[PDB]
Design a protein around this ligand. Sequence first.
Ligand SMILES: CC(C)(COP(=O)(O)OP(=O)(O)OC[C@H]1O[C@@H](n2cnc3c(N)ncnc32)[C@H](O)[C@@H]1OP(=O)(O)O)[C@@H](O)C(=O)NCCC(=O)NCCS
Lengths: 96, 96, 180, 275, 96
Amino acid sequence: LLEEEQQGPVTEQDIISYVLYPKVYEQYIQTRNQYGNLSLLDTPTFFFGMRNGETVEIEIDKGKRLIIKLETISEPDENGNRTIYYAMNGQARRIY
Amino acid sequence: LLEEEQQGPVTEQDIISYVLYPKVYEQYIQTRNQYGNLSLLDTPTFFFGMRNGETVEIEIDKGKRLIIKLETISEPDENGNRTIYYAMNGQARRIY
Amino acid sequence: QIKKLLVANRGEIAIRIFAAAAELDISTVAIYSNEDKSSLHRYKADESYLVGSDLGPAESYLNIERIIDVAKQANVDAIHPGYGFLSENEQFARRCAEEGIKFIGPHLEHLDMFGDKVKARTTAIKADLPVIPGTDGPIKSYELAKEFAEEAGFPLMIKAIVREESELEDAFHRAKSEAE
Amino acid sequence: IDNPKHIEVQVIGDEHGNIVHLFERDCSVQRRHQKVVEVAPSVGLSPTLRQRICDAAIQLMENIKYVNAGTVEFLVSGDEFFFIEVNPRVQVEHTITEMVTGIDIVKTQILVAAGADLFGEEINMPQQKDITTLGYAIQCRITTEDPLNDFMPDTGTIIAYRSSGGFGVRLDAGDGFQGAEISPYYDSLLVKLSTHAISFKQAEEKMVRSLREMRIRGVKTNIPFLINVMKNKKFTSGDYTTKFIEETPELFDIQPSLDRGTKTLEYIGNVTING
Amino acid sequence: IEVNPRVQVEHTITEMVTGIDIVKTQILVAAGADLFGEEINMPQQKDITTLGYAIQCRITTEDPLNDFMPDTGTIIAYRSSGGFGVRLDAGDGFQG
Ligand SMILES: CC(C)(COP(=O)(O)OP(=O)(O)OC[C@H]1O[C@@H](n2cnc3c(N)ncnc32)[C@H](O)[C@@H]1OP(=O)(O)O)[C@@H](O)C(=O)NCCC(=O)NCCS
């Protein structure tokens, strides 16, 4: 069941995890799908995000420390989506 | 004298204009260096800038007409300099 | 042989080499300074490592021992030094092979033959090659200067241009002045 | 026909009766009716077949006195080749014949319309018996067609963009840059990737390296599919049929390039705006 | 004159006229490939030739009207060329 749900390999740790907390284990999988591994984020960033003008570093992989900066946030658009102006690794990224 | 403050070539129109209005002309050419051929922007843009989310076309030259969108304007930082997030002909540009 | 490759450089040649490295399926590692934290090259590679938070911008790419530090912990195989930094440093080329790190370049002696302004000239004459005639070393006598001018022929460039011989006098003294 | 090899031939005429051919290009790597990969020239073709096909093009193209750039299309089965259609214009993959023969195809069009003779000084087209191919070129069109959703064009805003280059890589710029919003009204092409080498395997290695070095977030993309098509032994063999995608299952599967750098940004954004 | 025992900044043009990958070979020499084996696969000296002419331009922030002093600051817009005949080697230039 689990191998097809993720369409990939699965450890025993996953198996007992789902057996003990099914609707919870699967909910965490959705979150690792969406945002990746959050445990690697520092606690303050994980809880409050970033403040305008804040530089922050997060190691996501071996020798892959990505340097993030939040520059400003836009007023929400017609639907309700705001624009965030980042500075990841010295190059500018925007995300809604 | 006028061939000295400028880069060289001066037209007779410049010469007669300086003698009629000394400070107005010295001020004019200074603004000429700053902002370009200011007389090419439409009156509403020349007087009011741009509202947030608005696109505006500036016929910079015959067939040369650039499509400028103002996305957002930031809070002022220390030294009181804001950042302006522009969309110019599809590409993205920041202005202090 | 080469399974992982570290570029002891920055900027265009690091990207140049990463593209070449990842064409032969060679894993690539980059180094960077605190000033190159935002550099474009340190994510053209698989991983990237600071030289050390305590080094200035030029120190970060010239510290032979900490560069060796980052490579040894990167368990890297070879090192390409690129150009313009430690590219031809025999001491770096010596330190590399000392650590089982294949230095991508010439053999140790080659760096020596071609490292100084006179040693390279000497190996060049040994292989039957034309060379710009010069004084054997530096000189501090007009007499040896006139000895070289009536043996090399004009023009002549003194440093530390002369065509007619009436200038070789007043020019050879001028350089000896400013050099002093 | 049965299990063939789609092969075009590039001819070029002037307004004075002089026509030359810059040899062929293989476009047998096709999924639906549209072509996804084209190699110039064909690896699996014999020098005898290549010549009869090229001469077949020159015969047709000179019998009707075709002028300017054009293409004659052929299907190839065994020793037998046949004719299908003609495209009297530039093709998207003219870049790879430009790369292996050296003649600027689009530029030659402009001077031909002006009236310059093919073998004049402004064009200086080589004489036909001197035209040749040096190496092997491969062209990839990087599009926003979801390789895992029937190749349906993804529409949205590119939030990050990075082109490759260096020795052996030639890019032709489309709608791909940082901040573009891909309209659903046109063919969803972002950038034309085109490599070259002295072998067709060095060009494969060069092509995947650039396909990997590519960076386009904010929209879906057919790079991982184009990557599989490259790396497959059935492709690097040099001989593949129109029945190649259909015959190869492992091409469509793609491991999703986890967008760690963006997903992190997305999370911090949510908790900053939404708490 | 002199001999530099290292690859050079102007190496790109020698790759395009002759056809051989200079930096690639450099790696496979330290990997001990035979200069005429499968890996390096070098053509014999007689069969080494050049086709055409290549030119290289290093674009720098050296102001050619100020003693070539390297200007610094923030690039606020960057567009690169391409197409038939153009080779780009990325350095320090990018949007921000
Ligand atoms: C697989 C790979 C190509 C990235 O694929 P992914 O699975 O989609 O991405 P990852 O989750 O590994 O990385 C995401 C972020 O890591 C960061 N990152 C990657 N390599 C980095 C490095 N060496 N140093 C610091 N940060 C790095 C970037 O911010 C990247 O963001 P972007 O790729 O969205 O711009 C990876 O092998 C890699 O390192 N890529 C960068 C180098 C590259 O493009 N190499 C291709 C050969 S030239």
